[PDB]
């Protein structure tokens, strides 16, 4: 029932990454640190800072051995369109996963069942697929990227010093 | 069992229509001839001929009192963006309903359960909410708007001329 | 759930085809494009234009490797009589399948349960038995054979090609 | 669970009788003697001698207060066409009921499930809707209308002589 | 679920035939024509004309290769007694099957459930066990053996000479004259 | 599960009694002692000694207020025929119930399901419908009528003198 | 459904028989005529004439090759006490089976469910374990031992002579 | 699911008490303290010390308002016979309930299913029918009547009290 | 399925707050901002800073109108003992709820089913009972109190003016 | 239904014993006499007389080859704290098992479901893991340690002398 300290479930989703489409599965995450950054919808007026802030810290995340996977219930097709429309989103070098089925979102118990959109949840996952940190916020409340990085560092220190 | 000659089910969806966001329910379809034009996805590399062909026949559809509802599992936000970025979709003066939940799509039994996208379906609906014509096609196979237009005229004629 | 992109189910019906009584099954549709043209009843006062239009395009459909199967819940005996009586139905050189059991009609979820008659539904089926197009209409709303033929041409092109990627003409 | 000495179940079928379409129900049978003459199909290659043989005795049946209801799984539309087609079927003054649903045929346990056609069965039914005689035969074994008339007269004698 | 054109179901009953008792099963009906002649009860005040009619045609039936099995829910013991008591039944040289379980009567869907007696029914069966003719009547409505015998000869003709049924082709456009 | 000390269930059967057909129901057994004497079949080769033995003791049973009901799955029609044919069965002045439905036989859980014949069982029933004595035997094993009479006298004694225990004394 | 002409079911009960305790199973009944004499309870105020009557006929039952099994829901301990406490029960040389579980009683469909006691039922069982005679009575209605013996002789004669009446 | 702190279930059994036969129900336990003293069987070779030990404290138990109910799967008839045969059981002036149907034994989850006999269990019950103390022992492990009597006094002391808090 | 933006479920737990035992229910949280600070166990060799960190920021939380509810599967009796034992836990002015049934913990989907202890989860709740923020970490990975304060301020800002 | 004369279930619990944490399973009980002394909670105001009474008899329980396991739905961490906070509990040299899951408690059908605390039950278990004696009491009704010892001696005697005349 509690998702913390449990293994991520298998998936197969299409994504957009650096001007091309790819297929991403649980096989790709294993052996590496992973960040599943869920959010409600592309092309929303509200707050694209969240994705842009993570894009500003991406070279630090690559040095720390972390992959970022932005996820929403929109298709990989619209991620490509949104990546060309907005200069905040255009900075994103990491994968933007499309989840129209809601299967990846439902593996993390993160669906707004009334809206058909994912809640603003972030899941730090280790090389064995175990979820080490969770952070969820309501609509309008932002997640600051510096706090994410602190939990990544904190999880990595605990990984090598039990 | 078939959806032909059954009543449409209740729904509540957000939609984009002529530069403005609106909520559309089954109450809005009551008393109106309604075309529910389902399609898989916005921003695909497939040509937007199906939707553009309906847009070319929209003045003719307006003379028959027909409301067109383009439906996909994309958000109404994504519909606005597509309407701005595409030359063919910019012509659309009819409602583009967003269906992220899939509730509207599942009311017409029209989901691709593997993909989370609607199949290419067209449902002609009369003022009492009764489905008079159904047209479904596999991916790639387009549907003709003048054929849809012919089907609406026939449905209106049958309603107006009981028995022959 | 939709019948689109599903495999057709097995059947064994008797049919009238251009003088002979024959038996048709799902085996006969394998390796061939197929059209299952459901209609309500023989000897009604509704115009048979639908079945006559398909007969006019039957040369072209045969060259496209397409078999046509007109279906109703009447018997193959009744089809023969209607083929002799009606001047429009006399044109058809394709199979008129009889489905008094309603088994073939119920495979395509096309029964008017109250009437015991099939709804007005055309199904385009490919060589692997997969339904590529569906068209259903209420009483009095005809279907166009030119539209049907355009879809078959489209379905054959799409089967022979990958997903479409638009040029600069649209 | 034999049908003999059981009441006929309700029905509502379209029928053809002397150049017009009418609706027949169980309400139309009550008060009068009835013959439910089931047969396989219209427009068959097999002779309509059985149906014409009842037509030859129909004036005699009407003297005895006996209605004839010829039943089949074809529509009432095909009955009209077959009535104008065949000289033998043109003699039919009685109702030709259409049973495309098979409901009337199934009430008499008379459906060939493999073929969707009624078997060659004749039922004699009294004014209270009670089945007094049953006759079913295979394809090519004839039903003698003279034997049918004997059984009705026998049944009518028994009704008046407890 | 019509019984016509269906195979007869297996049975095992005790019967009386020509002053002795025998067991009869479905295997005894193989390769021969069979008449199953159901009736309500022995020792009733109703006319025994129906069993006598078949006994009068039994010499003719045996020449057509047709066995007769009279059946009721009475015992084979009771059948013997009635064969000694009544001169009409005393004529019967065919088997009188007892069916106190009702299993044979229920195989032919012929039981009066409220009475525990078989209805007045005649079933014609071919060498392959397939029911070719069914006749059922109420109390007092007779069955004449001449009509039965006609149907047997018709069933035998159709078996030996299939496709020689009356053609509707002496009528409508195409004719044979 | 046992039928002892349970009430007899409702029934309606046609019967033969002294050259006359009559209907017998549970209402006819009310307020009187009743013996239900089940047996397999009329016209059997087995000796009908059991029915003849009850016939001999029938006067005694009538003086004790006891009605006897012979039961089998044969019809009342065959009971009449068996009554005139057999010398032993001609002595029967009591009711011979027919049970071709098997309903009365199954109320006493006494049907040989594979034969469609009742087992050879005797049930003693009091004025209130309560079964006071059961006796069931296999084929060949005979039931004694003088033992049946002793059981009825004991049942009638216990009904009249309940709360009776064993005595003891001397001197 | 009738229990006549059905095979007895397996059981395992402790029993009292002539000064000592023994275990009785269905295997001990194989190949022999058996009488299962069920009764309600030990130490009741009703006369034990039933059991005593069977004890009086025991020499004749041994001649016929019959095992008598007196059965109640009391324990074999209670059977021992009753055997030394009553003159009529002290005559009993046959096995007194205890059935506190009620499994033996329920195998013969003979339990008074609201009392937890067996009904007054006698079952005659042949060498193949098949029940050939049943007899049940209410309280106060005695079972005759001469009648029981007559039925055993009839059962043995029919077993040995198939067909003849 | 422990039986502790649960209300006793309805029952209707016959019993031997001091020469008389009587009927005992759950109605008879209302408004009084009760001891249900289960045991396996009458007339066994096992010493009946447990029942005689409780009989010696019965005078003290009655002054405390405590009824004793010895229970086994044997009949009330068998209790009467056992009462006369043994000198130890002759001391018992409390009710000896028979439970041949086994319902009262099964109400306290105390049946040896494959033997058809009750286990060696003691259940102390208060005036509201709530079970305050349970004791179960295997074969040949005796129960102390003095220990039972201590628990009753404690249960009566605590009955008229809230949560205990130690003085030190 | 997601707990975020859902109402808190009813509860009734015994708590220890400033030297007295009090019963806390959902009705006590109604009309006020609430923080449900879950943790594994009392008397652990693990860092007790997490509880003391919140106690150091408690004056600032009281100005913002925030009630803190520390929750574990230990008894309220145990919380009292731990409040007397450790000088770090002695600083705690706020209510320490005991949850031996696991009912309150299972309302927030926060039970380690194999351990019978609550995970290190923090739930910010508004006056209407709606969960506005969630934070869960594994064993060893701490939660800083300054981030909790920012999420409360951000949640309050969004409540005052949504736009 | 009855838990008497049944084998104990497998378990895995953390425990405190003489300033040291250890794991205890059913493997540790195999081949030994075991007393499972359940109780509701640590740091309650109720007197700890029960546990202190068993502590006074632990030396002779150890001579008899008997292990004592105090069990509660508290943690092994709280047991350490409670051992250093109370003079009565400080006497305990036997294992104090923590059962926060309630699994061990539920194996003995001893959970107060509405409270989440074990009932006041004592289970004597032989070297084959078979439950020979059960004692459950309501709150306030104390369990006597000398009676427990008297039962253990009887249980050991019956094991060493199977079957008896008297």
Numbering used by the authors:
A (entry chain D), D (entry chain I): 1 to 162
B (entry chain E): 1 to 164
C (entry chain J): 1 to 170
E (entry chain H): 1 to 177
F (entry chain G): 1 to 171
G (entry chain F): 1 to 165
H (entry chain A): 1 to 168
I (entry chain C): 1 to 163
What's the publication's text?
The Prx subfamily enzyme Prx1, also typically called 2-Cys Prx, is among the most highly expressed, soluble proteins in the cell, and is characterized by two conserved cysteine residues. We used the mechanistically well understood E. coli as a prototype to construct a chimeric Prx, EcAhpC1-186-YFSKHN, composed of EcAhpC (residues 1–186) and the C-terminal YFSKHN-segment of human Prx 2, to be compared with wild-type (WT) EcAhpC. The chimeric EcAhpC1-186-YFSKHN described here demonstrates, that transformation of the human C-terminal YFSKHN-helix into the related bacterial AhpC confers sensitivity to over-oxidation on the chimeric enzyme. Structural details of the oxidized and reduced chimeric EcAhpC1-186-YFSKHN provide novel insights into sub-steps during the catalysis of peroxide reduction, enabling the transition from a fully folded to a locally unfolded conformation.
To understand the structural effect of the human YFSKHN-helix in general, in particular inside the chimeric EcAhpC1-186-YFSKHN, as well as to identify the individual amino acids essential for sensitivity to oxidative inactivation of Prxs, the crystal structure of oxidized EcAhpC1-186-YFSKHN has been solved at 2.7 Å resolution. The asymmetric unit contains one decamer composed of five catalytic dimers (α2)5 with each subunit containing one catalytic active peroxidatic and one resolving cysteine. The intermolecular disulphide bond observed between CP47 and CR166′ in the dimer interface confirms the oxidized state of the EcAhpC1-186-YFSKHN structure. However, the structure in chain (H) could be resolved until residue 177, showing amino acids 167 to 177 oriented away from the active site and stacked against the neighboring symmetry molecule. Similarly, the C-termini of chains A, G and J are also stabilized by the packing interactions with the symmetry related molecules. The average main chain B-factors analysis revealed three dynamic regions of oxidized EcAhpC1-186-YFSKHN: (i) the CP47 containing α2-helix, (ii) helix α5 that contains residues S86 and T88, and (iii) the C-terminal tail region. The sulfate ions observed in the interface region of the structure, emphasis their role in stabilizing the oxidized AhpC in a decameric form in solution. Superposition of the recently resolved oxidized EcAhpC structure with the corresponding dimer of the oxidized EcAhpC1-186-YFSKHN one resulted in an r.m.s.d. value of 0.4 Å.
